[PDB]
UniProtKB/Swiss-Prot annotation, chains A, B, C, D, E:
GO terms for molecular function: structural molecule activity. Coiled coil: none annotated. This is Major capsid protein. The keyword Methyltransferase does not apply. Keywords: Capsid protein, Late protein, Virion. Expressed late in infection. The chain holds residues 14 to 306 of 347 of the full protein. Belongs to the baculoviridae major capsid protein family. It comes from Autographa californica nuclear polyhedrosis virus.
Amino acid sequence: RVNRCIFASIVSFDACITYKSPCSPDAYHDDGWFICNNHLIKRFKMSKMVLPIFDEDDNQFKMTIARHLVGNKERGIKRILIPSATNYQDVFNLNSMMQAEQLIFHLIYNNENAVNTICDNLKYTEGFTSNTQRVIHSVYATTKSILDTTNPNTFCELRFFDVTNARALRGGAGDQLFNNYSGFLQNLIRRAVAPEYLQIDTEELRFRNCATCIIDETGLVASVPDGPELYNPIRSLSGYEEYPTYVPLFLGYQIINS
Amino acid sequence: RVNRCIFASIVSFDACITYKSPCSPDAYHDDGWFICNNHLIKRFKMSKMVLPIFDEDDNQFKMTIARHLVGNKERGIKRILIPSATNYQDVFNLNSMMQAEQLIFHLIYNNENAVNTICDNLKYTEGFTSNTQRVIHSVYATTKSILDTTNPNTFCELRFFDVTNARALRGGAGDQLFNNYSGFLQNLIRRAVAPEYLQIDTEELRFRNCATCIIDETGLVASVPDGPELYNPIRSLSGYEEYPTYVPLFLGYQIINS
Amino acid sequence: RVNRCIFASIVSFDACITYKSPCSPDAYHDDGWFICNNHLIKRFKMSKMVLPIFDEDDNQFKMTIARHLVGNKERGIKRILIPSATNYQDVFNLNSMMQAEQLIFHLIYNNENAVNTICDNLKYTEGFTSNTQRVIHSVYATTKSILDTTNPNTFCELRFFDVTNARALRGGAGDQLFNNYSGFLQNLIRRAVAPEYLQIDTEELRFRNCATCIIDETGLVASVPDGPELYNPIRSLSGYEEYPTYVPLFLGYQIINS
Amino acid sequence: RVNRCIFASIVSFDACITYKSPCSPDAYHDDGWFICNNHLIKRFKMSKMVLPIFDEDDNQFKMTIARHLVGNKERGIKRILIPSATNYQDVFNLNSMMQAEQLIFHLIYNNENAVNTICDNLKYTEGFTSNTQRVIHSVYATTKSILDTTNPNTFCELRFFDVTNARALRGGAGDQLFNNYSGFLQNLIRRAVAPEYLQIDTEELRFRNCATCIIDETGLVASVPDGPELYNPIRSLSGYEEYPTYVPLFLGYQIINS
Amino acid sequence: RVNRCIFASIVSFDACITYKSPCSPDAYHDDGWFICNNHLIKRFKMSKMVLPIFDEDDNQFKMTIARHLVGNKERGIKRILIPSATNYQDVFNLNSMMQAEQLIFHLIYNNENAVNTICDNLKYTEGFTSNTQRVIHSVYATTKSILDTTNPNTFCELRFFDVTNARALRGGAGDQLFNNYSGFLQNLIRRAVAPEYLQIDTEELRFRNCATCIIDETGLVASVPDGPELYNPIRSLSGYEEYPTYVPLFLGYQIINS
């Protein structure tokens, strides 16, 4: 009944130009993703999927996994999925966006300087105190409400992104750089990439033979390790089921108790 | 329709003992106070009042002020209204409370050690994973939702608690120690004590001749400066209106623009 | 059933021009004030209030207190409430009034010379002996009846207006100059300003933190001590009671026995 | 029938967000102004007026003059009307605008670097070749069509902005800095400010006693010379005509032949 | 319903020649001007206008301003608007007028000698006592009725005509010579020229950049200071409002209270 997408609070507060709310109905669902599928697709090269685990509990245990939207022709920065705070200005092309969305992106990426600049140059516009202050108050408040509930400050599950001493707390440089992203970014990454190795109680399940995406200082980038880029039809004998060839986001390791 | 009191999320998660929701209907109102009047009275020696300002705008400008619940007989720590983080263990008598309320109080007062202790000794109880984890998750989540929206990190009004260079940003030790309280504590204090000097645009209004409460390292304490304690009937020629003799919370200075 | 206001006996004894009796119904009540609220407001910057004392007797003990009708913009002589006998000609603008009211004011202020002048120049008018003598007889008689019952000659309670040796009979210059006013003036002042310190039996109650009005040689003037003038809306979140911001008359000290 | 406003070709080429065409019907008229009144008001503090000249020819000779939209309270950069190329980033707040409008403004101000940046970072967006290239082609083509017809390269009237050797070609620093603006800026300025001294054939007409606006390195700014700012009601005995108190744009000198 | 123009009482009391009443209907209105617009135009080079003030009160505050009827070709005495008592014989060409109008002009200009001459040489005519005495009585009585209600003897607003110590009572020679005109002349001048600087309460409004007319010993003359004479079409792209180029009477300074 209430939208839970951080990009759902997008309004063009220019007082004469309109905006849109193209979020899919899945935004209202408390699936864990604080972003609707439509914005998850149009901004990141990412789509949502559910993943079933028919473990010994015989329960309908469902986790969340992601989907590439990048094929093979595009190389380099075009293959990125979630950029880090260092190099997202160029990839996101912030100037194309509306100020509500630049503010949301900077809050996601913790750019206090950018927020300060947008705030102290936005006051120069006319009609600011009439409704611009109230609307920016509303958008900033709801964005912080979405952001703080995902804050990585441990609550009151153990995830790793590299295979280094799997039966331990040791992690690679990917894990330590991933800890540097904000709460919303960390939550989105955690819900997006599923671990190719899962530890339930004391047993192990391997969903993917070998990792699909990679984590670098540039961020979550869909650059397949040690090989040519995986085929992706992108898209939008008949008796056998289709078995769609969509490439998922498989990376890391997980320790699960109880 | 939705409760906005931090003490409204009080549940006795002992699985057999009950709890209460004695919040007054004013909790649902978005008055600014993130606490219902009933808990504001039963925990702090504080009650709510509205205050009108018939300024040049001729608008129905209403601010929030507070009320003592302490008379004259009680002295010392009994006269405190909002203790600081240093000395609230003794005044609040935390052990009398339920664990939901100790957790709420420690979150209000930023006692990470106390939260860690309650979390790692609460897991020892039986039936924890069944519903205790879920209920503590709910209470902690709603408490952090209430707390973060009041966080003193400036948004995207200038309040002082001492008379030192009124036409400047200079403030006394009271202001600098008041900055040390958490977001909820700062918001409650700001909504509670009204400034005896108000600056609207470029003119000044003095509501109270001289300050009633005081701010010390012990906290907000209703110790009247340089004199015997103010009379307070506590309580719960007929033609003339009653003019109730309730003693309010008047302290500080305010700068208001537009 | 009988009016007890000194200004209720106002008649324009010009034999062709009319008069008014705008006294509120509280004039008939034997509240102690020998003046109706309407004249108390239109002549002095004063309004009536009752004040409750929920002392150890648990009785409905009500005293009388007053209210300013002056804001902040008016300064100097405009801020006076009850002028002394020295400087009331200018503030009251006696010439604007009718002769009944000048006579009443001079009787209140013990101006025997002014009464002599008005009496020996009023006889010059025509039709004097017909009814003017009888009507001036009636008004003077009722005015003296009101005045003598308030005469400060001790009857057959100890009030002070300065804080000098509170546990003694010592008083400041304000008390000794206040003794110089006539009986009606002293009674009106005593019923108007309530003591910020009250002594009941052997215990003390402080209603006001610090004094609001002041007593000078000019009289009772609403000049707040050592600070800018108190805000007063003058006039003539909704769930919480209004708590009107009317500024009262608090000054002095009282000793009460039994 | 065809729009002649440079700001009329404003389209939000984000492929899902809309735009507006709020130009007044005067845009279609070939009045000389290459901007509609609505954009002339919303972007510059400028409004349009016609000015009659009942000279010896007895013809209905009409010229174009402008109107301030700034009062007295706003000072400094807020008083500017047409900024120069040096300091228009801050006053116009380019980031608030859509890319069509930033491109139009940079083309008006001859910011080749800004155009290069917007062009080589706009290609990064998706769906660019589909319609974004065509729409940016259309907008850039029509903007250059509007700009080139106003190019200050003399065609195949003599205007000055300072009083220095009026009967000569000598001009102040204002004229030489005004020559530095682009064709559209020069045309807008020339149509906006009317010369307080006009020379028709061999005779002189003085419309304004003394100049209203000023020309500085900052640009056309409505800072009245040597005095407090002129009163301007802004806005949006009855028998006499209103004589509106709108403040016009009067500055300079003109030499007119035939 | 009753004419309030001093020139409306013009009758040719030659008993056989007629007269005219060409006053416009605005004469009946109590606008403050004691002269109809038709005579204000035909005698002085002056026309009426109203001027709006959209101050903070948001009220429809209208003052009175005047209009030149002189262009640029006429120089010297032809440019005068209201001559002083020293040099009005030549400019007004009194001999052209009828005796009613010479008498009115001398009464306006306080020429007791001229009135004495016209009275003691008018009695020489035949038929004087029949109706000439009665008609001259009527005209002189109504002229004095118009004149005395404008007498500069302060009633039971502070106007200056020079900029010398604006925040004070200091005034130039123009003010002291303007005090020398009669009541009707002073009232006409005050209603005619509007102050280029107005002080309302404690704030300042500048309607005109710099003064249009001037005050000299010769009188109110429309000689623009330090420059060539202002263009005036005299008289009696279509989408934009006309903005008439009529030159007003702006001079002086005003202090207004309440």
